[PDB]
Coordinates of C-alpha atoms and ligand atoms in Angstrom, one line a residue:
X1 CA 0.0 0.0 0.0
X2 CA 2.8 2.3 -0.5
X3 CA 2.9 5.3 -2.9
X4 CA 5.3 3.9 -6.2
X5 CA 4.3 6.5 -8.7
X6 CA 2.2 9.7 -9.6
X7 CA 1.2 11.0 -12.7
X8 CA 0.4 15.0 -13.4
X9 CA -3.2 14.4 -15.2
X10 CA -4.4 18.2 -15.4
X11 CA -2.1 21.2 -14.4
X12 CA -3.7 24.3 -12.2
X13 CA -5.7 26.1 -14.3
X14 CA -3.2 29.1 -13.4
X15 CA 0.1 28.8 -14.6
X16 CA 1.3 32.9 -15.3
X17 CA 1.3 34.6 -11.9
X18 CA 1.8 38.3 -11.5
X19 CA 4.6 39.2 -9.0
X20 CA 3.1 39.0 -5.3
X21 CA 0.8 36.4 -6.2
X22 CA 0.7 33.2 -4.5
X23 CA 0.2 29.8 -6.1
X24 CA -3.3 28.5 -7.3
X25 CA -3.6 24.8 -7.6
X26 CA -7.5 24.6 -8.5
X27 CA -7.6 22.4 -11.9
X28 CA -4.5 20.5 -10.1
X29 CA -5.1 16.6 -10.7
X30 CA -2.7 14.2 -9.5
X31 CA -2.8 10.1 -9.5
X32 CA -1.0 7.7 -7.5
X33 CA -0.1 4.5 -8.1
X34 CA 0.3 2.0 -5.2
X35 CA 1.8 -1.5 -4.5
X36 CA -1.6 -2.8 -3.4
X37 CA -2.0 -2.5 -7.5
X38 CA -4.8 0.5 -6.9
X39 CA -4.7 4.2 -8.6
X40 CA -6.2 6.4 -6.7
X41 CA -6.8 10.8 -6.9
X42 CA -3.9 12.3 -4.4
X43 CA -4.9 15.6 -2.8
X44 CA -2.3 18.3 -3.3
X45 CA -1.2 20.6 -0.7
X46 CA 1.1 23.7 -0.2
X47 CA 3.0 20.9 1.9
X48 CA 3.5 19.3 -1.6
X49 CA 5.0 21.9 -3.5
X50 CA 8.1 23.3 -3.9
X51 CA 10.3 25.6 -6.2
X52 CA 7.3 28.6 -6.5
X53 CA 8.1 32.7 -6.0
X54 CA 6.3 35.2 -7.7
X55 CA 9.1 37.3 -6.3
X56 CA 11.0 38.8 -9.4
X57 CA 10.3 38.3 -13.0
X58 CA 10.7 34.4 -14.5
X59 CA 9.9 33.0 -18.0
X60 CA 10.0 29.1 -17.1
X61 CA 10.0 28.5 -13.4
X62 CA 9.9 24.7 -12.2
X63 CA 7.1 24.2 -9.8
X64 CA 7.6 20.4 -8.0
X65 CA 5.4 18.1 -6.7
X66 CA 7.0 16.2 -3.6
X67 CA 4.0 13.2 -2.7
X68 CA 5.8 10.5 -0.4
X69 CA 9.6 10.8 -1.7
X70 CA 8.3 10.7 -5.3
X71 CA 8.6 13.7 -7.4
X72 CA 7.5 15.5 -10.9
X73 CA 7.8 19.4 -11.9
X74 CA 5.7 21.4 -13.8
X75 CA 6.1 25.1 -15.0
X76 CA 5.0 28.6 -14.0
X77 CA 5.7 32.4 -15.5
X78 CA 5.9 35.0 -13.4
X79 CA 5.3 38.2 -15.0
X80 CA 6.9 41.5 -14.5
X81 CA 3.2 42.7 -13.4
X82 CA 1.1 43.5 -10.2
X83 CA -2.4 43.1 -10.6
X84 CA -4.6 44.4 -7.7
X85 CA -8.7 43.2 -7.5
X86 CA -8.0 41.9 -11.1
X87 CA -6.9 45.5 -11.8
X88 CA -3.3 45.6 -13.7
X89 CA -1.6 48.2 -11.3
X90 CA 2.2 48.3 -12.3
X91 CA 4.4 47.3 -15.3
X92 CA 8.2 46.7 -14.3
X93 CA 10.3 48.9 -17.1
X94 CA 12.9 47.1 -19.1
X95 CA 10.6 44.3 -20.9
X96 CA 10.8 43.6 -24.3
X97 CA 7.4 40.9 -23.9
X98 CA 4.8 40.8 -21.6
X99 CA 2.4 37.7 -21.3
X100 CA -0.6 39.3 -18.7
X101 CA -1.1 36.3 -15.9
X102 CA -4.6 34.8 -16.0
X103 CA -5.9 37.3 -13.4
X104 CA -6.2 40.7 -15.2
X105 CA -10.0 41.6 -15.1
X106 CA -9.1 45.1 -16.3
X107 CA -6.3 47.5 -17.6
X108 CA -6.9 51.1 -16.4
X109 CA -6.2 54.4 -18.0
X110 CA -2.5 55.2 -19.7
X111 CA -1.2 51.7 -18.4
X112 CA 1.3 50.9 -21.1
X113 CA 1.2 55.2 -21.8
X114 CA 4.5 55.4 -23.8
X115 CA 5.8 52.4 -23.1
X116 CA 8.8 50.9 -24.9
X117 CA 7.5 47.4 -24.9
X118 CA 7.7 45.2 -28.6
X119 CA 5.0 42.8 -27.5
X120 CA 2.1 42.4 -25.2
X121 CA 0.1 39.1 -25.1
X122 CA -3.1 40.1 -23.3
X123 CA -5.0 37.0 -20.9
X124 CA -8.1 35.5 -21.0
X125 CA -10.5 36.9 -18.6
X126 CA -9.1 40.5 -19.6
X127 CA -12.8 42.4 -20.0
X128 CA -12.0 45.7 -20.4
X129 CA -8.9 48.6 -21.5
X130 CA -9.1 51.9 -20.1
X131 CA -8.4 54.8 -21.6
X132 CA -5.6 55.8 -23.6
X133 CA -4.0 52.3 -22.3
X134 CA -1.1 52.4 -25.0
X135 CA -1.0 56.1 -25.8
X136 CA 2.3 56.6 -28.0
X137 CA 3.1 53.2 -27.0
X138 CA 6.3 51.8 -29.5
X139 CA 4.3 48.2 -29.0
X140 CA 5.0 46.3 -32.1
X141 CA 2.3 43.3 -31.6
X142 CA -0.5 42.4 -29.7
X143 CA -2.3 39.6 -29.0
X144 CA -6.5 40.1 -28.0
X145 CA -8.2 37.7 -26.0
X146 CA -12.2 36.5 -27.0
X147 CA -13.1 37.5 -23.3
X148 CA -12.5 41.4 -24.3
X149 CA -15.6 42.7 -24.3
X150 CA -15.4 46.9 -23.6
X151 CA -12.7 49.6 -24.4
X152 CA -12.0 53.2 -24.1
X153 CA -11.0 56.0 -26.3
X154 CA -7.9 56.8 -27.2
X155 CA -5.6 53.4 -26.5
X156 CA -3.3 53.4 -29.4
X157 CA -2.9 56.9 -30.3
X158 CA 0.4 57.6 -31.6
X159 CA 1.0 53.6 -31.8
X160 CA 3.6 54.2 -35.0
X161 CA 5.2 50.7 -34.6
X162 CA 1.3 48.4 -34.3
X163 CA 1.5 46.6 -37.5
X164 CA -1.8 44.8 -36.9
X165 CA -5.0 44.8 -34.8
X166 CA -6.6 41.7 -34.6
X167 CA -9.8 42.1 -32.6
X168 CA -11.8 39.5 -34.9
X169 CA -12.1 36.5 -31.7
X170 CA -13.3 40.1 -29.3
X171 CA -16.8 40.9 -28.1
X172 CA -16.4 44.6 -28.4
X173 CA -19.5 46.0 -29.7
X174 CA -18.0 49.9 -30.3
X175 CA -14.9 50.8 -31.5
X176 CA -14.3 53.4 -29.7
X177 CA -13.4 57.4 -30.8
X178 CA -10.0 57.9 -32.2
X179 CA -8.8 54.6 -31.2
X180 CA -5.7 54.2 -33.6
X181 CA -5.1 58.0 -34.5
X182 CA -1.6 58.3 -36.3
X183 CA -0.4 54.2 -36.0
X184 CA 1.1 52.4 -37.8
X185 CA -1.5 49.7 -38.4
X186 CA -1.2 48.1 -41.9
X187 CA -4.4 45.6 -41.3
X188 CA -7.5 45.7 -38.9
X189 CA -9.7 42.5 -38.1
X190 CA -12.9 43.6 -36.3
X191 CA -15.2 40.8 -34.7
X192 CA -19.0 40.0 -35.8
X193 CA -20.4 41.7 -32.5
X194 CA -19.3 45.1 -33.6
X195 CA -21.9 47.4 -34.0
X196 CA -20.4 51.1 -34.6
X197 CA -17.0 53.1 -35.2
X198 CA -16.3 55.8 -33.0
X199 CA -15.9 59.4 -34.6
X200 CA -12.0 59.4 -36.1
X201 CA -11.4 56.1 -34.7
X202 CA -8.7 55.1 -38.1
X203 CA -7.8 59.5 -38.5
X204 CA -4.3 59.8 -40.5
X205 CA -3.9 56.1 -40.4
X206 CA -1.6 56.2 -43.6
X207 CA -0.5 53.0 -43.4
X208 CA -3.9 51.2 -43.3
X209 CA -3.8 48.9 -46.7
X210 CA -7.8 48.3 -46.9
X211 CA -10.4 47.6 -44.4
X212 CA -13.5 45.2 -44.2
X213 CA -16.4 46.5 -41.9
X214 CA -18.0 43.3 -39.9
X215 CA -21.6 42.5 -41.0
X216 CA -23.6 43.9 -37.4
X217 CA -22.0 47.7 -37.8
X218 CA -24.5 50.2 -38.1
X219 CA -22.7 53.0 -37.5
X220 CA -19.1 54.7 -39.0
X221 CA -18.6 57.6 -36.9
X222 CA -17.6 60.8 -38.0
X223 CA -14.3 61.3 -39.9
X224 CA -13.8 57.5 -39.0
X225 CA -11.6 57.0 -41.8
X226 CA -10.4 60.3 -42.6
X227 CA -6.9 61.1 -44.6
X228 CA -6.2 57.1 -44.0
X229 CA -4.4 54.9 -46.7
X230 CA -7.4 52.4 -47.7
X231 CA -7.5 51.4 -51.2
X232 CA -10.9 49.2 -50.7
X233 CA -13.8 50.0 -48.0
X234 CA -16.1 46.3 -47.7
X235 CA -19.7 47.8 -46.3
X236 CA -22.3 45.5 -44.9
X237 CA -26.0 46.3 -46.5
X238 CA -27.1 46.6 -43.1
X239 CA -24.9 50.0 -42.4
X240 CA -27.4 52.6 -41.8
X241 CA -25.0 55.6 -40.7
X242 CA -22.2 56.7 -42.7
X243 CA -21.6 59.7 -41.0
X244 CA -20.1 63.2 -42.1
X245 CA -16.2 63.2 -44.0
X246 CA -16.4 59.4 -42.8
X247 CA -13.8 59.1 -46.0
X248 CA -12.6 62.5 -45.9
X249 CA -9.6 62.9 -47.9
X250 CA -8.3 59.2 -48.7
X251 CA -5.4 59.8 -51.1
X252 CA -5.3 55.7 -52.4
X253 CA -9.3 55.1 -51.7
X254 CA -10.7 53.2 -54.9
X255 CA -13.6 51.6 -54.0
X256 CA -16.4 51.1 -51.7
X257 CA -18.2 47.8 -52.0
X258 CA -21.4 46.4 -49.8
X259 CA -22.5 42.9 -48.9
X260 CA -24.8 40.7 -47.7
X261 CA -28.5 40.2 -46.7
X262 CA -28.0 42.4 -43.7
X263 CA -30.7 45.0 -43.7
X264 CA -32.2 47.5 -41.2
X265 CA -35.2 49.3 -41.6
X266 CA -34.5 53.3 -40.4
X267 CA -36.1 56.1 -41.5
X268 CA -32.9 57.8 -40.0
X269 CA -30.5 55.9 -42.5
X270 CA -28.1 58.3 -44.1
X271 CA -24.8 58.8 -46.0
X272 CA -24.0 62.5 -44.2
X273 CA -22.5 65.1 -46.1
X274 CA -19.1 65.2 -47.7
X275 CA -18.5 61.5 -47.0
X276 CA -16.1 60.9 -49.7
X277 CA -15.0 63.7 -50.5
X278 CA -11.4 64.6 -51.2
X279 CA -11.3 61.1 -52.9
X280 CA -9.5 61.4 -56.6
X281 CA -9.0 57.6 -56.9
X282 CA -12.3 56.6 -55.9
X283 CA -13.8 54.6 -58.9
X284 CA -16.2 52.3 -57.5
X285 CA -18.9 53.5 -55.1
X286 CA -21.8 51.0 -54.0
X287 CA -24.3 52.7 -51.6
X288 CA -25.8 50.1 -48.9
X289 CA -29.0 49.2 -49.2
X290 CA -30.1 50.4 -46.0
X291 CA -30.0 53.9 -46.8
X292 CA -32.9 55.6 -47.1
X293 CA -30.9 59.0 -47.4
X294 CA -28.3 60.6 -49.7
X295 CA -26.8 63.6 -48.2
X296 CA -24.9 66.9 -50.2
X297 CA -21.7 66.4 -51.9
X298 CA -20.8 62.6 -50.8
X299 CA -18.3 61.8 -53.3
X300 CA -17.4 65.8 -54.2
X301 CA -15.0 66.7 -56.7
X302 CA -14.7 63.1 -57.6
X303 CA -13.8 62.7 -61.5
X304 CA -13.2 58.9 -61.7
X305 CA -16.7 57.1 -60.2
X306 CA -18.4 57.3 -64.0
X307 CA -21.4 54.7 -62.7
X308 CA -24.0 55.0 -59.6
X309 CA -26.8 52.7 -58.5
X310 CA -29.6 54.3 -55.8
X311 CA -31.0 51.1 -54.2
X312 CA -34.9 50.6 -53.9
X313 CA -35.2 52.2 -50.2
X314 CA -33.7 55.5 -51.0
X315 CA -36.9 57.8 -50.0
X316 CA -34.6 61.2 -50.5
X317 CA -32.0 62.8 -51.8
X318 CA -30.5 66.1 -50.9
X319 CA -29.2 69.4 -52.5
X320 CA -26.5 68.9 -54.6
X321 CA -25.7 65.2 -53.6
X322 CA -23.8 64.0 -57.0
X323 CA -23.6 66.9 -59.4
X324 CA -19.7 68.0 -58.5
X325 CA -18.7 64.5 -60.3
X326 CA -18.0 62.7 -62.9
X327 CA -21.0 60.4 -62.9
X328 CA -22.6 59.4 -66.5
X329 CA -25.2 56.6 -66.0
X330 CA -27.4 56.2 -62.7
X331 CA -29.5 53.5 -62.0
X332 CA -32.8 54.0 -59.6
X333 CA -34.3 50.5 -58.4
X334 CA -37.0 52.1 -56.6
X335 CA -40.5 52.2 -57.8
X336 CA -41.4 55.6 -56.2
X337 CA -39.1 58.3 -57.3
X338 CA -37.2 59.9 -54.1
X339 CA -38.5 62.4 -52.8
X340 CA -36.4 66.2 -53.3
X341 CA -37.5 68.9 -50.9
X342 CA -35.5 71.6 -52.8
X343 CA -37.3 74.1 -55.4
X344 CA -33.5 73.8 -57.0
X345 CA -31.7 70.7 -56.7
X346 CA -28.2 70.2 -58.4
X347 CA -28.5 66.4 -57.4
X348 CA -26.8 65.1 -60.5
X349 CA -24.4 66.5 -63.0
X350 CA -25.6 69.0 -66.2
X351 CA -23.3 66.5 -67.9
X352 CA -24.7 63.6 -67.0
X353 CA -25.7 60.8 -70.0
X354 CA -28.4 59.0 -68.6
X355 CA -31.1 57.8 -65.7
X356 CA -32.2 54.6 -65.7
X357 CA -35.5 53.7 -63.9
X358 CA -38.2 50.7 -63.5
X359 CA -40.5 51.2 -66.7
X360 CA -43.8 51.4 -64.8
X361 CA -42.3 54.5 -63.4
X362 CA -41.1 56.4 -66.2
X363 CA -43.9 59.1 -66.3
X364 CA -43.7 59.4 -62.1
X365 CA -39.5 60.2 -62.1
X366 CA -40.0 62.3 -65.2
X367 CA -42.9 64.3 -63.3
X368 CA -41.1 64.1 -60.0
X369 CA -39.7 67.3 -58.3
X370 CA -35.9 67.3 -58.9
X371 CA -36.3 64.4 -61.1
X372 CA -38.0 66.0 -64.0
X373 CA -35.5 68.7 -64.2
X374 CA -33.7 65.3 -66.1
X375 CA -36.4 64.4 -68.1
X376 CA -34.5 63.8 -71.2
X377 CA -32.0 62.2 -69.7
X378 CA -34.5 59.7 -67.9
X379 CA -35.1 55.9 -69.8
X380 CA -35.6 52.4 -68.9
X381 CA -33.5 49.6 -67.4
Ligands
CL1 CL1 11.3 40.5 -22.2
CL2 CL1 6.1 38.2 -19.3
CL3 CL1 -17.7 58.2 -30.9
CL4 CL1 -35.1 46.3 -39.3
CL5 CL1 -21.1 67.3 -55.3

C-alpha cells in the first residue's frame, strides 16, 4: 500500500502569476499508483510543493510536486506585473514581452502610456482597456483575447510601430473614438459583435492597406476614416450611418463595396454630407442598401466614379448630392421616385448621359420634383 508513482493528469488552471501572487492549484489533478495494484486521486497541498516565487520576474520557473519521496515538476511564468482586484496596477520597465497572468480583469487608464514594450500578449478573462491604455506606446504586436468585451477611447494613439490589430475573436460591440489615431496599423480585423466606429477612430492612419467593416456595424462615426491609406472599404448592407467626412480625404481610396443580406429598416438611415470627399482615386462606389438617405456632396469633386446605382429604399435625396462628379449613368431601383424637398436641386451632374429607372415609373421620375429637371435624360433599365 505504498505510494510507487504519480502522474500529473491536469495542471492548475493558473500557470502565469503576477509578482506577489501566490500559487493557485485549483484544476490540479494528481494520480497515485500503489503497490496494493490500486490508482487512486492524491490531494495536493502547499506541503506538496516546492520551487514557487512570484518574487521577481521568470519566464519558465519549475514548480515540484513532492508526494511521499516521489517527485515531478511542472512550469510557472511570473510576469513583470502586479495586478490588484483583477486591476493591472504596475508594469516593471525594461521588458521587451509581456504575457498578462490569467488574473487581469481590467487594464486602467495610460497603463502601457508610452511604453517601450515590442510585444504584449493580453489573458483571457481580460474584459476591459481603459483609456488611452497604450497612448504613444512603441508596441510592435499584440495579442487580443475572445473575453474582451469593452474599451475606451484613445488606446493606441500615436502607436507608429502596431503593425496589426486583430480584434476578430473580441466581443467589443463599439470601437471606440479615435482609437488608432496616427499608427502604424497596416491591417485591422474587427469581430462580428461590432456594431459602430467611434468618430475618427482610423484619423491619418496612412498606413492602413484596406479595411473590411463586420456585418452587425450600423454605425461609422464621424471622420472614422479620414486622410487614412485604404485602397478598398467592404460595407455591410445593413450599415445605416455613414456619417459626415467618414472618408474625408483618402489619397489611395478606390472603392467602396457592400455585402450581404443584412438590412435594417431606419427612416434615419443616411450617407452624411461630404463623405467621400477629397477622394481622386475613388472609382467604384456602391451605396448600402439600408439607406434611405443621400446627403450633399458625398463623393465631391470626384472625377473617376463614372457609374452609380440608388437602391430601392432610397426615400430622399438632398441638395446637390452627386452633381460636383464625374457620374454618367445612374441607375434608380426604386418604384417611387425619391422624394427632393428643394425648389433647386443640383443632385446630379448637367453632364450627366443618362437615368435609368423601373419602366412602370417612367412618367412618375419624369414628373417628379428634382427628377424632371432630367427628363431627357431619364429611360428604362
Ligand atoms: Cl522581455
Ligand atoms: Cl512576461
Ligand atoms: Cl464616438
Ligand atoms: Cl429592421
Ligand atoms: Cl457634389
Amino acid at each position: 500500500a505504498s505510494l510507487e508513482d504519480f502522474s500529473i493528469e491536469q495542471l492548475p488552471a493558473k500557470t502565469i502569476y503576477a509578482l506577489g501572487e501566490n500559487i493557485d492549484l485549483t484544476g490540479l489533478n494528481v494520480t497515485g499508483k500503489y503497490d496494493d495494484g490500486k490508482q487512486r486521486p492524491v490531494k495536493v497541498t502547499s506541503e506538496q510543493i516546492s520551487g514557487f516565487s512570484s518574487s521577481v520576474p521568470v519566464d519558465k520557473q519549475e514548480v515540484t510536486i513532492t508526494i511521499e519521496g516521489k517527485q515531478k515538476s511542472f512550469s510557472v511564468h511570473i510576469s513583470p506585473v502586479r495586478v490588484e482586484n483583477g486591476v493591472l496596477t504596475e508594469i516593471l520597465k525594461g521588458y521587451n514581452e509581456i504575457i498578462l497572468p490569467n488574473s487581469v480583469k481590467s487594464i486602467p487608464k495610460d497603463a502601457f502610456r508610452n511604453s517601450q514594450i515590442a510585444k504584449v500578449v493580453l489573458n483571457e478573462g481580460l474584459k476591459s482597456i481603459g483609456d488611452m491604455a497604450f497612448f504613444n506606446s512603441t508596441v510592435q504586436e499584440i495579442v487580443f483575447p475572445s473575453t474582451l468585451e469593452q474599451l475606451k477611447e484613445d488606446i493606441f494613439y500615436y502607436c507608429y510601430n502596431l503593425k496589426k490589430a486583430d480584434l476578430s475573436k473580441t466581443k467589443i460591440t463599439k470601437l471606440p473614438a479615435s482609437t488608432f489615431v496616427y499608427a502604424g496599423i497596416e491591417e485591422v480585423l474587427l469581430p462580428v459583435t461590432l456594431k459602430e466606429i467611434g468618430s475618427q477612430a482610423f484619423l491619418k492612419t496612412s498606413q492602413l492597406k484596406t479595411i473590411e467593416i463586420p456585418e452587425n456595424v450600423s454605425t461609422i462615426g464621424q471622420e472614422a476614416f479620414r486622410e487614412s491609406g485604404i485602397t478598398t472599404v467592404k460595407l455591410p448592407n445593413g450599415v445605416t450611418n455613414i456619417a459626415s467626412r467618414a472618408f474625408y480625404y483618402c489619397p489611395e481610396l478606390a472603392e467602396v463595396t457592400t455585402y450581404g443580406s443584412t438590412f435594417n429598416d431606419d427612416p434615419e438611415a443616411m450617407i452624411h454630407p461630404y463623405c467621400l470627399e477629397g477622394c481622386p482615386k475613388l472609382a467604384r462606389f456602391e451605396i448600402p442598401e439600408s439607406i434611405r438617405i443621400l446627403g450633399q456632396g458625398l463623393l465631391g469633386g470626384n472625377r473617376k466614379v463614372t457609374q452609380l446605382t440608388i437602391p430601392a429604399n432610397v426615400t430622399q435625396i438632398n441638395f446637390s448630392a452627386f452633381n460636383n462628379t464625374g457620374i454618367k449613368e445612374v441607375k434608380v431601383e426604386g418604384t417611387t421616385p425619391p422624394q427632393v424637398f428643394e425648389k433647386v436641386w443640383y443632385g446630379f451632374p448637367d453632364d450627366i448621359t443618362v437615368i435609368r429607372v423601373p419602366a412602370e415609373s417612367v412618367e412618375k421620375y419624369k414628373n417628379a420634383n428634382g427628377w424632371r429637371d432630367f427628363t431627357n435624360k431619364i429611360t428604362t433599365f
